[PDB]
Amino acid sequence: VIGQAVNIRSMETDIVSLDDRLLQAFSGSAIATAVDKQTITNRIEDPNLVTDPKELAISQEMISDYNLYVSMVSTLTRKGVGAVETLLRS
Amino acid sequence: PENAVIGQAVNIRSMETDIVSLDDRLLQAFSGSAIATAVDKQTITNRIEDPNLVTDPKELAISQEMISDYNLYVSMVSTLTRKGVGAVETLLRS
Amino acid sequence: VIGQAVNIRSMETDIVSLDDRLLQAFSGSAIATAVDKQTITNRIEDPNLVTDPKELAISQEMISDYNLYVSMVSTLTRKGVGAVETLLRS
Amino acid sequence: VIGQAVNIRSMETDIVSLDDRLLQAFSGSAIATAVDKQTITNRIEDPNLVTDPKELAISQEMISDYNLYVSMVSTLTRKGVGAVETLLRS
Amino acid sequence: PWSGYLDDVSAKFDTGVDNLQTQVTEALDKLAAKPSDPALLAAYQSKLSEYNLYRNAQSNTVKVFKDIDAAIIQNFR
Amino acid sequence: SGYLDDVSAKFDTGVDNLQTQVTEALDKLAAKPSDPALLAAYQSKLSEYNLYRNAQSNTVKVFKDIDAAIIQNFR
Amino acid sequence: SGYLDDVVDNLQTQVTEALDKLAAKPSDPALLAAYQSKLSEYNLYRNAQSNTVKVFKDIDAAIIQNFR
Amino acid sequence: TPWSGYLDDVSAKFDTGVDNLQTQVTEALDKLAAKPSDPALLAAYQSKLSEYNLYRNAQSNTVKVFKDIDAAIIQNFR
Amino acid sequence: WSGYLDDVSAKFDTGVDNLQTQVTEALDKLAAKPSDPALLAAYQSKLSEYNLYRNAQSNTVKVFKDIDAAIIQNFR
Amino acid sequence: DNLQTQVTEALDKLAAKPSDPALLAAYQSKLSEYNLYRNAQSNTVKVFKDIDAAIIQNFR
Amino acid sequence: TPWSGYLDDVSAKFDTGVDNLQTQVTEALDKLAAKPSDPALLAAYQSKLSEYNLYRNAQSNTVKVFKDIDAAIIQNFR
Amino acid sequence: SGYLDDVSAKFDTGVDNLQTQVTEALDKLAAKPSDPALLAAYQSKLSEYNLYRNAQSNTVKVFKDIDAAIIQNFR
Amino acid sequence: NLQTQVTEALDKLAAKPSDPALLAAYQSKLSEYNLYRNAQSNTVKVFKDIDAAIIQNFR
Amino acid sequence: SGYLDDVSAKFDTGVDNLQTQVTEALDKLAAKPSDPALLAAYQSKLSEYNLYRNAQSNTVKVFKDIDAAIIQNFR
Amino acid sequence: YVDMVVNAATMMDKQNDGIELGRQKIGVMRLNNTFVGDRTYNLRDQKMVIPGIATAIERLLQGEEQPLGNIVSEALKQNAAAGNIKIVAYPDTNSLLVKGTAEQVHFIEMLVKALDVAKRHVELS
Amino acid sequence: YVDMVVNAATMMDKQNDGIELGRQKIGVMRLNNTFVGDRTYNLRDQKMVIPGIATAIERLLQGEEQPLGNIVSLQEALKQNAAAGNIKIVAYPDTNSLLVKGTAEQVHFIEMLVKALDVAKRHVELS
Structure with missing residues (x-):
């Protein structure tokens, strides 16, 4: 609409070891999380969006999806670490 | 203040120097954490005893944050301390 | 505007007086004084003050703090005994 | 002011076992409760008591006091049991 | 058979106007025989007006107590 | 007894005689339902009663809810 | 209290005083309107206090349990 | 002492405002009843009776308006 | 010494400078001569204005108590 | 703090003349909007910090 | 300045709109009272008394309508 | 700004001049309260104004309720 | 969708608030819109609570 | 279009010609406001129209309540 | 010593808050040159109707919040609101009754004497 | 000793709080130079209407909250701090006298005012 831009080409990298596959998955999740949190915060303080039923119906979903996603990542990380701890203790 | 911005010319950091002992590095942490928590608890209490703070939405919204930040801080210090002593115990009983 | 003041040079702590109350976990004398008062009372003043919101807000502090103190002693004794058993086996 | 009675020197030269202290407490509470429930129900049945403002204003206080008493006994009992579990439980 | 309180409030009016409830029907039974007698018209105007006021004040009064009682009972929650 | 009865009583020792006056005025009016002098007095007394009973009951309700909140936070 | 033991006024007083004044004349609009806001502010104060005491005790219980 | 509320005082303010209308009405009536056909007495009575009517109406409408303010405030204690 | 719902009531009580006395005055004058149409016409205005003043004041304090109680409920 | 300032302005103008219907109509709106804003903010703050507490409780 | 609301502004518009009627009425009354049988005084009094009556009626009917419009809005703050 | 303000202002723009048509027709009537053409003119304008304000208020109320019911489910 | 239909019914009404035929149509539209929005929000919440409960179960 | 629209339209079709009959009869009356035949004809039509609109609105109101009360229990 | 001093001072302070120090006085002022009513x-x-001095002054001061001063052609007690001033005409002696604070009474008196000036007779032929 | 002094002093204070110490005096005053009504x-x-003293004073004091003093033409202070609006004056024509209800100080001030106001009138003969 007005003053809008999109990045067409992503920069690229080689992926050759489990180390780089791990750092890449971490960095991929961190940024998506920060972006989502900021977006929600703005949608809560633009007064055209806080008070319109159509916009509130959207913000509800965005909040839910955020909650679910971060809870999943937490659970699966703790399960993996617990499996390592269990085997080495045994 | 609100009508002023105040920087630091360049942030050199003498406390980045490691020079103190592994135990002085511990006493600093303990002393600073103990003071920070006692100050925070007192402030939260005052914000509730005082009648003009506990009855204005603008002030309540701030107090909610203060309480949550306090909770998270103490819970994390406790967790990391437990994990730390638990490592020592795991190694020495092995 | 009125009565405004600020301390510029140094972070001298002023919201609290820094004191030996930093260096203890429970104010055991304050417990022992409160527990005295709610137990010396046998047929004096009146019973059943379940209902006045000013005294009922004082009971909440004591009922919580004595439960925590008793819970703590239970752990300390187990730790102590466990330390003795650990040394004697090893 | 009607039929008041008080015991004196309750603990001065005799002491009950805990085994009995619990039993007397339980009995003295359970009967008072059952009588208060009957009193309320009867004050609701009588056509002359549910239609007079003076009698309704009395019944509101009875219901409020019954509800607060039973809630306080239940909470304290649960909290006191919890401590014995934390003591015995290995 | 059980009288409540509103019943008593109403009966206070009935036992107040002890005889008006008969007087109205007797003055009517006089008048209907000879509608042109000024004495009878003058009498019946009075007794009819009285009976109107009495029934009206009775019903309003019962309603106010009904509205106080409901407002107390709603607080039992 | 209790504090909520103390609050309830703090009204009844406040309105000294109203509880009687209302019934007395009612008896007079019932004796002569068509006297405007009587009517005018009864309207006042009845209104003052209606208001007293409503204010009392709502206050007792509020203090009951304050205590029921605290006894839950005991847990 | 009249008492200090050596070693302003709060909402609890102001409510008791405004109730006491009101109960003398339950039908005056100035007094009613003065009492609504004191009873409201007392309700808010007395909730906020208890909720924060509860938070500090649950923090300490969690610490003791974590080191069990 | 005989307790009296705010509405009581509002009502009584009219009674003390009209010093004696309350009895002038009855005396005028008795005088008329003695001689129903005298124009001077008829003219006096018409005035006093009208005045009485308007007084009683203003009184009851003001008392009701104040009741309906107070009920609307004590509603919000909840 | 007072909270913020008293600051909100007092904004009305200092906003309508004098009405609180003007009503009593008008009633003192009308009580003396109920049959005067100029007095009646004046009193109708004052009494209506006072009725609205009180309603707007009480509903505003109710709303601010509903906002505060909801924020405090989240302290949990 | 714009929506906090607007409501206090509206309130002063209203308190000046409580019977003016144009002022009443404006204030109704401003107060309603402020009322929704506060609730939305408080609820999201809560959600964001309940997620942190649940993370710590997961490893604790 | 004596504080005035909105209702007492609407009400005052009528008072200043009928500049002098209030006094014209009493003047006409004192002449009529000086000589009731004069038809030229009679026919002049009729028009003024009628104008006064209508003025007062319209005035209070309007004040009431506005109060109803405001109370209906204040009912929606809750 | 906000959305309820847009809803409310939509009426103000729907009726272009009514807020000061009323004030003008009143100023005209107040000059000659007995003219029937002026009375008949004023009756309709004042009626229209009454309805306008009622509808305006009730709609803002309904939208408030819908928003509060949605925000209640963020938790 | 319903959003536009309600917006347009409002625009037609505000042109002539005193027309009964317009009022009756608006009452109906605004009512249906209110119900729709509420039902939608409640269903969304229910599904998310189920989803969360599963995680809390295996956590 | 939902169910409420259906309930409204049942009234619209239940009265065939009433709206246009009212519009017509008004213009006949306004052409000669002093004819008793036209006056008598108009009173009845306008009364019918009044009852029609009222019944319609009160019914839609009731149904809305039954629906909102059910929807509340989805939670 | 410090603790005793502090508590004694604070409680003696609180025991006086209920005491009121303001007061009202009444000034009787005869008009030498004109009718009061x-x-x-x-x-x-x-x-023709002409308002008196009491009517005009009351109509001027009605509702005033600020204190008066400087009429031209602990101190908390001093700052009484002008709206408290009351004036009542007493034709029986052709005098004014004034109720308020001493400075107010003074100012009012000065104003009255600025105003009750006798008239010049004029004969027309 | 300290515990018994603290307790006794406090309980005595609360037993005394209810005693009412204010008294209402009645003064009777004859007018010598003017009619009362x-x-x-x-x-x-x-x-033409001329109001009597009673009316004029009851109108002047109306709703006053502060105490009277300096009229011109521990418990002590608590008693002295008596509101002006409680003064009541009733004209008694049968003996050309005023009945005055108030505190002794108020009664005194009122009396002084009365004696400032019933001056005897001069006579004027017009030819």
């Missing part, structure tokens, strides 16, 4: 003249074709 | 003169062309 409102005047009215009845003429063949006219009625 | 209001007077209406029914001139051939004009109705």
Whole structure:
């Protein structure tokens, strides 16, 4: 609409070891999380969006999806670490 | 203040120097954490005893944050301390 | 505007007086004084003050703090005994 | 002011076992409760008591006091049991 | 058979106007025989007006107590 | 007894005689339902009663809810 | 209290005083309107206090349990 | 002492405002009843009776308006 | 010494400078001569204005108590 | 703090003349909007910090 | 300045709109009272008394309508 | 700004001049309260104004309720 | 969708608030819109609570 | 279009010609406001129209309540 | 010593808050040059009403919040609101009754004497 | 000793709180130079009203909250701090006298005012 831009080409990298596959998955999740949190915060303080039923119906979903996603990542990380701890203790 | 911005010319950091002992590095942490928590608890209490703070939405919204930040801080210090002593115990009983 | 003041040079702590109350976990004398008062009372003043919101807000502090103190002693004794058993086996 | 009675020197030269202290407490509470429930129900049945403002204003206080008493006994009992579990439980 | 309180409030009016409830029907039974007698018209105007006021004040009064009682009972929650 | 009865009583020792006056005025009016002098007095007394009973009951309700909140936070 | 033991006024007083004044004349609009806001502010104060005491005790219980 | 509320005082303010209308009405009536056909007495009575009517109406409408303010405030204690 | 719902009531009580006395005055004058149409016409205005003043004041304090109680409920 | 300032302005103008219907109509709106804003903010703050507490409780 | 609301502004518009009627009425009354049988005084009094009556009626009917419009809005703050 | 303000202002723009048509027709009537053409003119304008304000208020109320019911489910 | 239909019914009404035929149509539209929005929000919440409960179960 | 629209339209079709009959009869009356035949004809039509609109609105109101009360229990 | 001093001072302070120190006084002031009451003249074709001094001053001060000063052609007690001033005409002696604070009474008196000046007679032929 | 002094002193204070110490005096005063009631003169062309002292004073003091003093032409302070609006004056024509209800100080001030106001009138002969 007005003053809008999109990045067409992503920069690229080689992926050759489990180390780089791990750092890449971490960095991929961190940024998506920060972006989502900021977006929600703005949608809560633009007064055209806080008070319109159509916009509130959207913000509800965005909040839910955020909650679910971060809870999943937490659970699966703790399960993996617990499996390592269990085997080495045994 | 609100009508002023105040920087630091360049942030050199003498406390980045490691020079103190592994135990002085511990006493600093303990002393600073103990003071920070006692100050925070007192402030939260005052914000509730005082009648003009506990009855204005603008002030309540701030107090909610203060309480949550306090909770998270103490819970994390406790967790990391437990994990730390638990490592020592795991190694020495092995 | 009125009565405004600020301390510029140094972070001298002023919201609290820094004191030996930093260096203890429970104010055991304050417990022992409160527990005295709610137990010396046998047929004096009146019973059943379940209902006045000013005294009922004082009971909440004591009922919580004595439960925590008793819970703590239970752990300390187990730790102590466990330390003795650990040394004697090893 | 009607039929008041008080015991004196309750603990001065005799002491009950805990085994009995619990039993007397339980009995003295359970009967008072059952009588208060009957009193309320009867004050609701009588056509002359549910239609007079003076009698309704009395019944509101009875219901409020019954509800607060039973809630306080239940909470304290649960909290006191919890401590014995934390003591015995290995 | 059980009288409540509103019943008593109403009966206070009935036992107040002890005889008006008969007087109205007797003055009517006089008048209907000879509608042109000024004495009878003058009498019946009075007794009819009285009976109107009495029934009206009775019903309003019962309603106010009904509205106080409901407002107390709603607080039992 | 209790504090909520103390609050309830703090009204009844406040309105000294109203509880009687209302019934007395009612008896007079019932004796002569068509006297405007009587009517005018009864309207006042009845209104003052209606208001007293409503204010009392709502206050007792509020203090009951304050205590029921605290006894839950005991847990 | 009249008492200090050596070693302003709060909402609890102001409510008791405004109730006491009101109960003398339950039908005056100035007094009613003065009492609504004191009873409201007392309700808010007395909730906020208890909720924060509860938070500090649950923090300490969690610490003791974590080191069990 | 005989307790009296705010509405009581509002009502009584009219009674003390009209010093004696309350009895002038009855005396005028008795005088008329003695001689129903005298124009001077008829003219006096018409005035006093009208005045009485308007007084009683203003009184009851003001008392009701104040009741309906107070009920609307004590509603919000909840 | 007072909270913020008293600051909100007092904004009305200092906003309508004098009405609180003007009503009593008008009633003192009308009580003396109920049959005067100029007095009646004046009193109708004052009494209506006072009725609205009180309603707007009480509903505003109710709303601010509903906002505060909801924020405090989240302290949990 | 714009929506906090607007409501206090509206309130002063209203308190000046409580019977003016144009002022009443404006204030109704401003107060309603402020009322929704506060609730939305408080609820999201809560959600964001309940997620942190649940993370710590997961490893604790 | 004596504080005035909105209702007492609407009400005052009528008072200043009928500049002098209030006094014209009493003047006409004192002449009529000086000589009731004069038809030229009679026919002049009729028009003024009628104008006064209508003025007062319209005035209070309007004040009431506005109060109803405001109370209906204040009912929606809750 | 906000959305309820847009809803409310939509009426103000729907009726272009009514807020000061009323004030003008009143100023005209107040000059000659007995003219029937002026009375008949004023009756309709004042009626229209009454309805306008009622509808305006009730709609803002309904939208408030819908928003509060949605925000209640963020938790 | 319903959003536009309600917006347009409002625009037609505000042109002539005193027309009964317009009022009756608006009452109906605004009512249906209110119900729709509420039902939608409640269903969304229910599904998310189920989803969360599963995680809390295996956590 | 939902169910409420259906309930409204049942009234619209239940009265065939009433709206246009009212519009017509008004213009006949306004052409000669002093004819008793036209006056008598108009009173009845306008009364019918009044009852029609009222019944319609009160019914839609009731149904809305039954629906909102059910929807509340989805939670 | 410090603790005793502090507590004694604070409680002696609180025991005085209920004491009131302001007061009201009444000034009686005869008008030497004019009638106190409102005047009215009845003429063949006219009625004329002229307000008195009490009427005009009351109509001026009605509702005033600020104190008065400087009429031209602990100290908390001093700052009484002008709206408290009351004036009542007493024709029986042709005098004014004034109720308020001493400075107010003083100012009022000065104003009255600025105003009750006797009139010049005029003869027309 | 300290515990018994603290307790006793406090309980005595609370037992005394309810005693009412204020008293209401009645003063009777005869007028010597003027009629007590209001007077209406029914001139051939004009109705004119003159209010009596009672009316004028009851009108001057109306709703006053502060105490009176300096009229011109521990418990002590608690008693002295008596509101002006409680003064009551009733004109008694049968003996040309005023009945005054108030505190002793108020009664005194009122009396001084009365004696400032009933001056005897001069006579004027017009030819």
